[PDB]
């Protein structure tokens, strides 16, 4: 699965629609 | 690092076409730092648009390129026939270049026969225990043609030097050697030595070919 | 004091990203409590 939200991220687990991979899971801006 | 990929690396035009090309970006990146180059044939290249939407000077009005994000293109308005060149996209990073792959665009007119004479080996080449039998196909469109050679019937590949050129300006057609190196003994086993060209502008190859008369 | 420490951790949510550069100026911003927290410096400054 995605990478939920405050969680820490890396090359093999991606995060969600909508987040930037930055060593964990980052939103964008509104 | 960042890295960029290109789509597409070729396609070809006409004037009165209205072209588009595009620099895909492998990260989100700002728009104040990324250019363009153009590099014709032998030259060394020169800027081209600086800051993804101002022009350069010594440049007409029929340029842009425009968008934001993570998508980048250069569109031609009316086309000329000089701009049969490659083109580049740069992007700064940390601290080190990245450019692009290269954009290679083409000129397209009517379609036409090639033109094949072929030589014989040259009498110091026979001294020298060797021979070259070269079939030079000149002034052609397009590029994409094929040969073969036959020694009394038989589909020899084997001793084949191909080359083509670069797109001439002055018609945009195509030229191409083909060569068959043989020895000194292997060219005295036979007797003909046939060239043809398979081309989608004729059917039936056409030959144009040498004997042994006076050889 | 308290403005400064939630600007940080509101950039510690986000993302610096790099096609909005402002989100680093927050994290920048963090020097300025080096006056505020000493209270020598908070009376020199307020004399002035």
């Not at chain 2, 993804?52 to 934001?68: D, E, I």
Request: net charge positive; aromatic share 10%.
């Amino acid at each position: 699965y995605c990478q939920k939200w405050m969680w820490t991220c890396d090359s093999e687990r991606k995060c969600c629609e909508g987040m930037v991979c930055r060593l964990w899971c980052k939103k964008k801006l509104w | 690092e960042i890295v960029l990929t290109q789509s597409p690396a070729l396609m070809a035009a006409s004037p009165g076409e209205k072209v588009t090309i595009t620099c895909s970006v492998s990260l989100s990146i700002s728009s104040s730092n990324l250019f363009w180059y153009q590099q014709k044939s032998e030259t060394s290249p020169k800027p081209w648009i600086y800051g993804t939407s101002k022009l350069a000077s010594g440049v007409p009005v029929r340029f842009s390129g425009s968008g934001s994000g993570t998508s980048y293109s250069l569109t031609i308005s009316s086309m000329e026939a000089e701009d049969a060149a490659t083109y580049y996209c740069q992007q700064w990073s940390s601290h080190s270049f990245t450019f692009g792959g290269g954009t290679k665009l083409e000129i397209k007119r009517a379609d036409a026969a090639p033109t094949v004479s072929i030589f014989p080996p040259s009498s110091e080449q026979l001294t020298s225990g060797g021979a070259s039998v070269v079939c030079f196909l000149n002034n052609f469109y397009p590029k994409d043609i094929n040969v073969k050679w036959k020694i009394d019937g038989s589909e020899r590949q084997n001793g084949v030097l191909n080359s083509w050129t670069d797109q001439d300006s002055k018609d945009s057609t195509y030229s191409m050697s083909s060569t068959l190196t043989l020895t000194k003994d292997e060219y005295e086993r036979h007797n003909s030595y046939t060239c043809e060209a398979t081309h989608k502008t004729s059917t039936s190859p056409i030959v144009k070919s040498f004997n042994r008369n006076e050889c | 004091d308290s403005l400064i420490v939630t600007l940080s951790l509101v950039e510690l949510f986000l993302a610096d990203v790099e096609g909005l550069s402002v989100l680093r100026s927050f994290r920048l911003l963090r020097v300025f409590r080096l006056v505020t927290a000493v209270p020598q410096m908070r009376k020199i400054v307020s004399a002035l």
